[PDB]
């Protein structure tokens, strides 16, 4: 067999679920309807990571 090409489609779909979830929360908080929710900055670079992490774990395990 000499190896499977499955780890490369997991990572390719896991990088797409991370750069597709961080780019969703950033778009939700900067471009589409930016809100002054709590005095916190629009591009809150934290508080976007615990939701683009579980977009990376979810999209990978869907491709796993």
């Amino acid at each position: 067999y000499r190896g499977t090409r499955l780890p490369w489609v997991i990572f390719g779909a896991g990088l797409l679920g991370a750069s597709g979830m961080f780019a969703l929360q950033t778009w939700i908080n900067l471009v589409e309807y930016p809100l002054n929710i709590g005095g916190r900055p629009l591009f809150s670079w934290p508080a976007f990571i615990p939701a683009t992490f579980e977009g990376m774990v979810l999209l990978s395990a869907f491709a796993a």
Binding site: L35, G38, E54, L58, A61
Partner: peptide, 21 residues
């Protein structure tokens, strides 16, 4: 859209991922 600054919005992303993983 949901907020994505509150951990009840990360919960529905942790619990739903934890479930379906």
């Amino acid at each position: 859209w949901p907020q994505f600054r509150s951990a009840l919005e990360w919960d529905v992303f942790a619990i739903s991922t934890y479930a379906t993983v």
